[PDB]
Amino acid sequence: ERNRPLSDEELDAMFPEGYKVLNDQPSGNLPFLKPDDIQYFDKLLVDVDESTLSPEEQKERKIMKLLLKIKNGTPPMRKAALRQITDKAREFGAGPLFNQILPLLMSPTLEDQERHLLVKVIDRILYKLDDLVRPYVHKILVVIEPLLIDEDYYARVEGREIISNLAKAAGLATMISTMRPDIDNMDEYVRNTTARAFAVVASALGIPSLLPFLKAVCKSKKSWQARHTGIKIVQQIAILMGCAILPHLRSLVEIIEHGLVDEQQKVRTISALAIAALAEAATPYGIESFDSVLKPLWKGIRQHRGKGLAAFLKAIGYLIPLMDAEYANYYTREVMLILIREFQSPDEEMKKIVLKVVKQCCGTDGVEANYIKTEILPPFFKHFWQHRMALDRRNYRQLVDTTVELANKVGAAEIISRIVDDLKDEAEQYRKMVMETIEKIMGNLGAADIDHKLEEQLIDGILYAFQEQTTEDSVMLNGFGTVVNALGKRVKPYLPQICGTVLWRLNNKSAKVRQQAADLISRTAVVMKTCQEEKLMGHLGVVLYEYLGEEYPEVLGSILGALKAIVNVIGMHKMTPPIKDLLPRLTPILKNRHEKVQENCIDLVGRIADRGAEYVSAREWMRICFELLELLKAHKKAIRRATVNTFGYIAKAIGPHDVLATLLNNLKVQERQNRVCTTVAIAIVAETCSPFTVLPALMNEYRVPELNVQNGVLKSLSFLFEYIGEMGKDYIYAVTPLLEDALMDRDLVHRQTASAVVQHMSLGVYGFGCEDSLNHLLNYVWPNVFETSPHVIQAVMGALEGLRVAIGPCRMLQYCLQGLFHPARKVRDVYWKIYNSIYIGSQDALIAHYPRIYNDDKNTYIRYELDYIL
């Protein structure tokens, strides 16, 4: 739809004047239905005509009709349909809702967004349908089963959350009764999905809640498929819950020790995988509970060869750090020959298991460095350092971790002398993996073991890897920066050879090469000040001041970041691109619509306002403060946090008299993320400078007849009070009539802003003797607790939590008095919530503030201990 070609008339109709060229609709306003989805919405094309022929299930057709607004409708229409389905989930019932949601999600012509919307509708209708989806548990579990084994992590997390919500809503007996015929199924993928769902239900409902059922499923001797499914469920529960199965490790080990003894090799491999998952989950733990599991594992690893021997070797490598020093030394002396013999294995899974076990086999004492460098490192370099290992991510990350472990155990120089030959290869993935391994060796160990005969070769390999980059990955620049930080003063005959390559890469036909050169100059900017290189940095700054005319914005943002790094690494008033010829040069650069470039320009403007404010004639700052209001309303969450600091620095430099009027004039914009940012900038300007000078002006913005300007002024006052804290004791009497008049307004947003300002004044002036203004604010905020809005209720709860800590728990108990036994339940629930919040805030303070209760006929409630006096 978005990539369909259009004619000339459709292109001409979408352009205004003044430019020179160089039935099928169901019931009216429903969205367009797919031709393959005319089966679930087949009853919507005809008219309803409700006249003595409308059963209850036709109302379920309306539950389909809102589904027609939920699948491919408008996002406000989808939000309205989701609200109508969540507000009427109990009245419509879970039966027809499940009967309409089950064939919709099981369609073979679905999409990712429709499946995500169906999962969101199933999760949103799961809170109101509690204890009612027990017959519909299997119909939801059969649809949520392939979602956990999906490729996307977000869909798997949503499926796990839906399975946890179904296990919390259906209890423990229904989930065990529904998944009981789903263990002995003929399909292996359905059995694995049922085992994963049972492991998720055991993780969401507790380990002893499903421990005897899993023990009975594992101890039953009827078929190998049920035992394999139980072992897979135990392995998934051990891999999902890391440190949660640590008190229940013995009960899992006693069930896992019964396996790996039958004639079936698949059940033995599943038991070995479950033992390896239990060893890797609780580590270092389970030393005494795994004493009866190593004796069959060593026999299975020494008597046979294959996938089961590789699983036993992986289990031994996972349980070897979980033992003592002598036990690991005895296990490592008898497993190194089996690891060296399995280095030439043609299988990829056995090679991955050997690469995973080699990282844990040499991680402590017992293994000498000479034998590991003589008989372990040449076969690991000849059998694992290939081109096919860099293709898969799991085969490359584990190999890089094993190389980092071998460099940390034996030595970094012996690995750097053998890994530098692959840096100038013809493969990009192998060169990136070698650069990542070199960066990990430079970050973990360092470059002190590298001599002068290898550092120049490593620098040449890093330059060849950076100069022959085809992708947009930042691994090579980070590796070069880590190598430069590890070198330090040893890269002194290397700065002209890097500068001649950085300057030649800035003039090219491509756009990513100049951005990569600017990123490499920014990453190597801190290595020039510590190496007594000031003329090269002054030349690079003068080059970057003129190289700001790159038409690519990704190169211009990198050049601005390199200029900011050069200004941070050097002096602000001692730069050959000085601040007098750079701050007017960046004033048209701040009006860019980019994300990273505008954020870098805002950071440079903030640095020039904080460190070089005496380099301007007090005129460009007042013009840049008007452009700072246009730098907000961006979906990046980085420029809006720096623009307030830049406005505060400009107000501290040029005086808080010109920026405050602009911040008050820009508060009336009627746009999201534009009024809160100006209020935060005004609060930062009041916190950086004197808060009294912005005190009457903040009292002036409430005088204008406008709701948005008054709400922005109240938010600015609340943010200034929250930024001040203990300094708000002198500005409480000036804000007390404004907070008294703002709480009596008809608008709920102004009342919530006044409650937030009262909460900030209570949390800031707590313990200063200002309880009279806090009580006067609480006496007006107490009728505001009966609101129906959740935001106003949260603001009233925050104001109550501030007044309980400021005015004392006794005043909070007196304000909440005679409301716990109230006849109206809508006020009694709020009073009970306020009493629970006051008890959670201060439980010991409610003893002395408790009221006197008379004794009853059968029970006594009079405190005779505190009533007596000596």
Partner: protein, 90 residues
């Protein structure tokens, strides 16, 4: 995976009036084949242009690589095409 705010057409604001069609075709055609380009020839619409591409992904890559491009002495901005915002003058 693409946001619904992006489209095949992109608007440019505060453009130099002395720019020719070849420079605009070279600047817009760097990220992909450009289908059409219309420059403003009005005093009320000077400095703005509309570039429509053939591919949606190429138009998104062009709009991601044109916000704040280095041009002559003006602050040109690249934004997505909107039906309600383009007809604001009427």
């Amino acid at each position: 995976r693409l946001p619904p705010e992006v489209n095949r057409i992109l608007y440019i604001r505060n453009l130099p009036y002395k720019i020719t069609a070849e420079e605009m075709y070279d600047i817009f055609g760097k990220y992909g084949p450009i289908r059409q380009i219309r420059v403003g020839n009005t005093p009320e619409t000077r400095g703005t242009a509309y570039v429509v591409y053939e591919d949606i992904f190429d138009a998104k890559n062009a709009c991601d690589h044109l916000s704040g491009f280095n041009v002559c002495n003006r602050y040109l901005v690249v934004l997505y095409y909107n039906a309600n915002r383009a007809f604001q003058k009427m």
